[PDB]
Every structure is written in C-alpha cells, then in structure tokens.
Design a protein around this motif. Structure first.
Motif, PDB file in Angstrom:
ATOM      1  N   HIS A 189     -24.181  53.383  39.203  1.00  0.00           N
ATOM      2  CA  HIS A 189     -22.820  53.373  39.732  1.00  0.00           C
ATOM      3  C   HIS A 189     -22.780  53.075  41.246  1.00  0.00           C
TER       4      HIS A 189
ATOM      5  N   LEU B  28     -24.124  50.443  42.367  1.00  0.00           N
ATOM      6  CA  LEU B  28     -23.972  48.971  42.322  1.00  0.00           C
ATOM      7  C   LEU B  28     -22.550  48.496  42.131  1.00  0.00           C
ATOM      8  N   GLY B  29     -22.188  47.355  42.723  1.00  0.00           N
ATOM      9  CA  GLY B  29     -20.849  46.845  42.545  1.00  0.00           C
ATOM     10  C   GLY B  29     -19.723  47.767  42.965  1.00  0.00           C
ATOM     11  N   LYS B  30     -18.682  47.737  42.135  1.00  0.00           N
ATOM     12  CA  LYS B  30     -17.528  48.514  42.410  1.00  0.00           C
ATOM     13  C   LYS B  30     -16.577  48.390  41.236  1.00  0.00           C
TER      14      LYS B  30
HETATM   15  N   NH4 Z   1     -19.791  51.061  41.043  1.00  0.00           N
END
Ligand code: NH4
Ligand code: HEM
Length: 291
Positions: free
Chosen positions: A172, A174-176
């Motif tokens: 979690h 990672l990214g968004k």
């Molecule tokens: N995330």
C-alpha cells in the motif's frame, strides 16, 4: 476443481527471463504514467486482483485461468483502473504469444516488485487459460471501509494468516488511490515507486485524522498530505496486527522476506504443481543483466 500446472510447451527459464526483461524495459520507458509514478504499482495491484478471487472452499478463482481477460471479471467495479495495467501488458503478450494469461499477469506483478527495488519473488510458470465460464462472479474482492475483523475474516478465505495479511498490505506504500477509480484519493507516503517499509513507518509516525473525501467516503489523512484507507488504519487498531506493523517499521529485511513468501503464496493459491514441474524461477533484474 483441480488445477494442475502445465508448463508452456518447450519453454524454459530463458524464455521467461525474456518475457520479464520485456516488461521491465517497458516499465522504464513508460515512466510518465500517473504523474511520474510509472506502471509498477498498477501491475502489482493487477497481480493481486487476479489472484484474490480465489475461494479455498471450492478451489474456484485465483490466478490460474486468466479469467481477468473475460468481460465479467474485467468489468468488476473492484477492478476499476486495472485496465491500464492490461493495456500495458497487451503488446507484450503479442510479442510472446505462447505465455498463458495467468502466467503473464502474475509475472508483471513480480517484475514490477523487483524492478522497484523490492525483494526477489520466486515465481512458477504453468497457469493455463480456462474458459469464459470459469470466470468468478464479482464481489469476491474486499471492501476498503471496514475494520480489522473484516480483514481477518476475508483473508482467511485465501488461507492467509495475520503475518501474511500484514506483510502483504505493505504494498500500500506503492502508488495511490484515485478518486475516479475507488472513491479514495491520495498517496500513502513519499516513496511511492520504490519498494520500502514506508507503509509501516507512516502508520506509526503520522498524525492521522479522520475525514470525508469528495466522494463522501472516510479516509485517514495526515498533515504531510498522505492518506490511509480504513482497512489500512485497522492494522493499528488490532493488537495482533499492531505488533507486526511494529516489527516491519523496525526491520525492512524481515518485511522483505515475509512479503516475498506471502506474495508467492498468494499467486500460487489453488494450483497444483506436479512433482516433475520445474522449480520456481528467480529472475535477474535488468540491472543484474547490465541492460
Ligand atoms: N497506495
Ligand atoms: C483489505 C485489502 C485491500 C483493500 C480493501 C485495498 C483497496 C485498494 C484500493 C481502494 C486501492 C486504490 C485503487 C485506485 O483508486 O486506483 C488500492 C490500491 C492499490 N493496492 Fe490495494 N487493497 C487491499 C489489498 C492489497 C494488497 C494485498 C495488495 C498487494 C499485495 C494491494 C496493492 C495495491 C497497490 C500496489 C495499489 C496502488 C495502485 C495504483 O497506484 O494504481 N492492495 N487498494
């Protein structure tokens, strides 16, 4: 069901290494995606979604059949936004058409992790495309507005214990979340395209506030401008979860080891590997190959 793994006819390690290298090279080249995040995070999420539909009770769902490729599963609301990972892999598939889909989708998540500097994830080939009818119905993926009990119960369906749940959630970092996709918005920390134990640190160290977002959903917001879903926050509400979060915040290595095993298990769930199947492969990153 019994889903026996059948190696793609006549392919060996080197063949797989090449599919890996092609994904990796494209990750490098398409670095503008999602404001410079790159496609790593989305592939990681695609690999989890195609694997998370598994049901340990009847052996249906899971990475095996590459059913994501069918309309039903592809249009699952919980899958919104995954189409970009798909589109990214398509050309690759076209270049290596003998790889099955479950193999391709799963290898992208592995490639993504290792290329974002994560741990090595052993991977096994052998998934076989199954028919449109083997496609699981929607509603098998978890909701984000619940608590620790919910999470515990859900993961159990996949045979994952507490330690596995906590390790896996550290992805979690990672990214968004994206408003349009899930009704949640924001990243979870600063390094959102490098694999670290940042998730654990943020949950422990920030000053989170519960607020509603423009989609009218609640999320935990921090002053630094980060967010956590209720399900992520729940990891600090449960005592058993909380000590594991602590362990990870304190030892990136432990976390890497545990993630690695848990990720593999997640991707291998529901599949039977005959005694003669080849051992799991460990791919070299572009960097270890000087490419
Ligand atoms: N995330
Ligand atoms: C209770 C379990 C889970 C819940 C409810 C949850 C929910 C979600 C949601 C709502 C999003 C954002 C979607 C968007 O708006 O694009 C998110 C993103 C993501 N999830 Fe999960 N998920 C959970 C478990 C997992 C696990 C086990 C993994 C992998 C191990 C995974 C990896 C990711 C990644 C890497 C992203 C970022 C995607 C991007 O940047 O596009 N999550 N998750």
């Amino acid at each position: 069901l019994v889903h026996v793994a059948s190696v793609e006819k006549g392919r060996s390690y080197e063949d797989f290494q090449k599919v890996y290298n092609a994904i990796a090279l494209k990750l490098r080249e398409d670095d503008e995606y999602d404001n410079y995040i790159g496609y790593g995070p989305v592939l990681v999420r695609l690999a989890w979604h195609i694997s998370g539909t598994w049901d340990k009770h009847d052996n249906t769902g899971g990475s095996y059949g590459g059913t994501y490729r069918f309309k039903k599963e592809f249009n699952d609301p919980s899958n919104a936004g995954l189409q970009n990972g798909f589109k990214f892999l398509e050309p690759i598939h076209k270049e290596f058409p003998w790889i099955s889909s479950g193999d391709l989708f799963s290898l992208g998540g592995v490639t993504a992790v290792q290329e974002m500097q994560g741990p090595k994830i052993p991977w096994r080939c052998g998934r076989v495309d199954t028919p449109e009818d083997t496609t699981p119905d929607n509603g098998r993926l978890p909701d984000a507005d619940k608590d620790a009990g919910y999470v515990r119960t859900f993961f159990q369906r996949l045979n994952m214990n507490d330690r596995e749940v906590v390790a896996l959630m550290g992805a979690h970092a990672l990214g968004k979340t994206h408003l349009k996709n899930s009704g949640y918005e924001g990243p979870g920390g600063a390094a959102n395209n490098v694999f670290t134990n940042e998730f654990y640190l943020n949950l422990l160290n920030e000053d989170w506030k519960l607020e509603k977002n423009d989609a009218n959903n609640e999320q935990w917001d921090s002053k630094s401008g980060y967010m956590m879903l209720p399900t992520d926050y729940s990891l600090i509400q449960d005592p058993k979860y909380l000590s594991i979060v602590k362990e990870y915040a304190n030892d990136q290595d432990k976390f890497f080891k545990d993630f690695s095993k848990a990720f593999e298990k997640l991707l291998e769930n529901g599949i039977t590997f005959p005694k003669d199947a080849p051992s799991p492969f460990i791919f070299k990153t572009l960097e270890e190959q000087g490419l």
